[PDB]
Amino acid sequence: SGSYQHLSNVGSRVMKRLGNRPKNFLPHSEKFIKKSTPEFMKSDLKEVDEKTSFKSEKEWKFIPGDRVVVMSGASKGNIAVIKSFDKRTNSFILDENGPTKTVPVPKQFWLEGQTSHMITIPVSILGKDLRLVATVAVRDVSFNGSYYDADYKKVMPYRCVKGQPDLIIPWPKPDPIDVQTNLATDPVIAREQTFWVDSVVRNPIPKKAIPSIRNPHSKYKRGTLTAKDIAKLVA
Amino acid sequence: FSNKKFIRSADDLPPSSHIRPWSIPELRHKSFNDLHSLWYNCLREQNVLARENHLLKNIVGSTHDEFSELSNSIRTTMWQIRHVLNERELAYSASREFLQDESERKKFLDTLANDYFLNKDEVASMLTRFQLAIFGISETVDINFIDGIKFLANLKLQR
């Protein structure tokens, strides 16, 4: 690139205008993007905005790891374990059994054990197009209760089949994250308590540190009135 | 640098699933010195990533952004730390204000006296902690210190 743009926020208004393009000229914007992208990169599904993005595990009806039947497609009536979701598109990438496309790929992105440039790759698919399985497929799932998961380490909801709430579709237990990194502090030290609220006389963090912690010349923090000030103000 | 590498590969980087930023509650029960150390470690990490990120963007023209994401995450932890530092000071100030109101302080002292002091079924240890907590008396001189001494004398007389 030879840019330097990344070390600053210059031409901010222009960037905002470009970034927040009007939605009725979104086809115009993306037409040229589509053209630019090669076949193996580009996706058919609409790149949804971060507002309309499934952040919660309730908003996603399915998690990476669970088993799902595909429908409304070429590879329909096919069971597939969903591998990973795409965040920008609001869609899932399925395993080998799911929907795919055969596309030419350059030798930069060649897998070990390839004869041809042609490679089959999995297309993204929406949560609307595929239904759960348990063999019995599920029409729709609803969430009514919640609980702390041991493996996920989150207060996740209970996936219950729509109609009869007692038939729980359980979450897929994820793979064990064997953490061995120098930049992650271990559980014992991460949580060990070294502070206690003890003193009322001595303040906990020093007076010379305050200017870093908060702006002492803050225009927002208005001063309170006094009697003398009132008297001065009023005729 | 990190392990004397010109650039951390994808394998050399810490994976996203294994890594989490600090929680504000977790930070809240850490000492000042510890928090300061953590902050400086974060800053160091950012510098390492910033060097690398710059190289990636300026020279190779990538859009891989793992380093950038890491830097952002670190920045998040840093501001959370900054927030908890401010919050602790504010809490202290509020406590001071509360104590300054005389009746409330008197009530608090009475409550302290009733339950744990002057009771049976340790006391010295409580007093030493209480001394530090409420007055300027460790094991230098002020009106507050004097008041604490007087209170201690009163307690001794009672007991």
Binding site: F40, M41, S43, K83, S84, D86, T89, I93, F109, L111, E112, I121, P122, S124 | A10, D11
Partner: peptide
């Protein structure tokens, strides 16, 4: 999406 898939494939190959 493709890039992420490719990365995953590489990882699988490695392990």
């Amino acid at each position: 999406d493709f890039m992420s898939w490719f990365k995953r494939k590489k990882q699988e190959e490695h392990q």
